[PDB]
Design a protein around this nucleic acid. Structure first.
Lengths: 129, 129, 129, 129, 129, 129
RNA sequence: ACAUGAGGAUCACCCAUGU
RNA sequence: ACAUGAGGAUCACCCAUGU
RNA sequence: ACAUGAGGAUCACCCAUGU
RNA sequence: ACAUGAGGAUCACCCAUGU
C-alpha cells in the first residue's frame, strides 16, 4: 500500500484535468508535480510532524502556475508568467481518534465547497462583503 | 448582496450538519461562529489584503473543537477538551483574471477531495507512505 | 507486490483482533499504527540500513499500550496508562542467500512459538529456570 | 514449572528440524545451543532484570549461521560473514499483569507471522516498499 | 501510472533472463534487486531531485556481479573484485518538455545500442582506438 | 577494426536521425560531435583510466542541446537555449572476463529499454512511484 | 560516524566505552 | 530549534516579537 | 593524488569529506 | 511594519533569520 500516488488536482470534467504525480520523498516531504516542463508545472508538497508533545502538524503546500512563453532575444522558453501559493498548516492534538480526524476533513471540504463564502470570494477576486 | 452569510461547514447529510454564522467583521476580519456556548463553537475567520504591490493575500482560519464537559469541584462547564487549528494563506498576483482564480479554487477543492492522498492521510492519523 | 500492507498484530481469534495499518514512510522508516487516537495506538516501525560494508541491519520497534481514560484539568482524555516497548535489531551479512534468510525467519518464529521457553517465561512474569 | 528445556528452533516439519538444548546458566543467563561447533551453532540466550524502578527488561539474543555453502565442522573466516545476529530487548512496566504479558507475546508472534510484511521483507533480502 | 514494477535487466532471450524486482523505497529512492544474496545481486536504484533552480537531476545506480567463476551463495572477498559499479547522473533543465525528455532517452538508448563504439569497447575490455 | 567510428545517437527512424562522428582524441579523451556549429552540437566523450590497481573506470559524457537562434547585439547567432548533461562512470574490476563485461552491457541496455521503469519516468517528467 | 554494552528511556531518543 | 504574527517571498525561504 | 557524496555546474570543471 | 521558515501556540499571538 501507498498514498504517495498520482491524483487529479484540478478536475475539468475528464479532459483538461490537471494530474499531479509523485516526484520525490526526501526528508519526509512528499512532493507531486504535473508533467511537462517543470517550469510550468503544478506542485504539491505535504509533510507531517510532531510539533509539540500533544500535537502533530501537517504542512501542505500547492503552486498553481500561470503558463506563458518567455521570449528573450529570439529564444523562447516555457515559463510560468507567475504563480499562486497556497500554504496551509493543520494542527491536531494527539487525542483525536479517527472519527475526529474525519470531522476535521469534512470541515475543510465544507469551507471550500462551491457556493460557500470563501471559495466564492476567491473565485471572484473579492473579499467578504 | 453579501457573502458574509451563514453556511454549512460540516455536512453530515442534513442532520448533524455544522452551520457557522456571521459574528463580527471588525478591522477587515470576517468571523463566523457556530451556535451554542462560544466555548464549544466552531470558528472561521477570513481576511484579504494587498500583501505586496503585485499580490493580494487571503488568510483563512478554522477551529474544530472537541466538545466535552469540564467538572471542577462539582461545577460543570461546557468546554472544548481541545481544538484543531487550520491556518491557510493564499497568495494571488494581481494579474489573475477571474478564470485564473477559479482554477485556483478547483485546485484547492481537488487537493481535499475524498480519496486523494492528503485528505486520506489526515482522516486516518497518518502521513504519506 | 509492496510488502507495505496491513496485518493483524494481535490475533485474538477473529474478534478483538488488533490490526495495524501502514501510516508513514517518512525518512525511510516504515510505520504502522492501529485505529486509535495516536495517544492510544499500537505502533510498529521498521527500517533497514546497510550498517557496514558487509552487513545490513533491520531495526524493528513495537509499542503495546495499556489504554485508559484520564481526567486532566477536570476533562476526560483518551490516554495510555503505560507502554511496553519491544526493540529488535537483526544484523545479516551481505553474503546471506534468500534461503539463509528464510532460516533466520523460522528461527525467530520458533523462538516465540506458544509453549516454548521464552514466551512461557514472559507470559508468566517469570525468568528462565 | 521449569522452563529451561530443549525446544525446536527451526521447524522444518520433522525432517531436518533444528532443536536447541540447554548449555549454560552462568549468572542466571539461560543459554541454549544446537549440536554443532560454536562457530557454526544456533544459539539463544535470555535474561530478565528490573531495568528501572518502573520496568523489567528481557534481553533475548539469537545467533543464526549462514548455511549456504557452509563446510560443516570447518573453519570459516571472517566470522562476520558467516553469522547473523538478532538482539531483542523487551521492556515491560511493573504494572503488567500476566494477561497483559500474554497479549504482548501475541503482539510478537503476530509481527513475525508468515505472510506479514516484516518476515517477508527479511526473507527476501528487502526493505519495505 | 505506477512505474515501480519488475523488469528484465539482462535479456537473454527468455532462457536465463535476469529480472530485477522492487525491493526498497526508503526516502523515495526506488530500489530493485535480483533474487540473490546482496553480495551477488544485480541492483538498480533511482531518484530525482531538483539540483539547482534551473535543473532537475536523476541519479541512477546499477551494480553488476562478476559471474565467471562465481560460487552461488558463497562468500567471495574482496567485494571489490567481484562487482562492477555504474553511476549515472542525468541533468535536465526545467524547461525540458516531455518531448525534449523523450529525445534525451533516445540519445541514451543510442549510445548503448549494440554495435556502437561505447558498448563494443566496454564489452571487449578495451578503450577507443 | 577501430571502434572509433560514427554512430546514430538519436535514431529518429531514418529521417531526422542525429548521427555523431569522431572529432578528437586529444588527451586520451575520445570525442564525437554532430554536424553543427560547435555551439549547437551534440557531444559524446569517452575515456578509460586504470583508476585503481584493480579497477578500470570508463567516463562517458553526453550533451543534448536545445537549439535556438539568438539575437545578440542586433545580430543573429546559432546557439543552444540550454543543454542536458548525462554523466556516467562505470568501474569494472580487472578480474572481469569479456563475458562478464558483456553482462554489464546488456544490463545497461535493459535498464533503458523502452517501456521499462527508468526511461518511462524520465520521458514523462516524473519520479519512480 | 561507526563500534559494543543481560546500559537507561517517557522509545527513530540518551548514556558509556573500545576506532 | 520551539512558539506566534490578517508579517514578506521569487515559496520547505526569509523577517519580528514572547521560551 | 587518490577515495566517497540521491554534492553543484555554465559540464574533461568545482565542492566537501574520510587516506 | 515587509519577507521567509515541513519554526511554536492556548491561534488574527508569540519566535528566528535575510530589507
Amino acid at each position: 500500500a501507498s498514498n504517495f500516488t498520482q491524483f487529479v488536482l484540478v478536475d475539468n470534467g475528464g479532459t483538461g484535468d490537471v494530474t499531479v504525480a509523485p516526484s520525490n520523498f526526501a526528508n519526509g516531504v512528499a512532493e507531486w508535480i504535473s508533467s511537462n516542463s517543470r517550469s510550468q508545472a503544478y506542485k504539491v508538497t505535504c509533510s507531517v510532524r510532531q510539533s509539540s508533545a500533544q500535537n502533530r502538524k501537517y504542512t501542505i503546500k500547492v503552486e498553481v502556475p500561470k503558463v506563458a512563453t518567455q521570449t528573450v532575444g529570439g529564444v523562447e522558453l516555457p515559463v510560468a508568467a507567475w504563480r499562486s501559493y497556497l500554504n496551509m498548516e493543520l494542527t491536531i492534538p494527539i487525542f483525536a481518534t479517527n472519527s475526529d480526524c474525519e470531522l476535521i476533513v469534512k470541515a475543510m471540504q465544507g469551507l471550500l465547497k462551491d457556493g460557500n463564502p470563501i471559495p466564492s470570494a476567491i473565485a471572484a477576486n473579492s473579499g467578504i462583503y
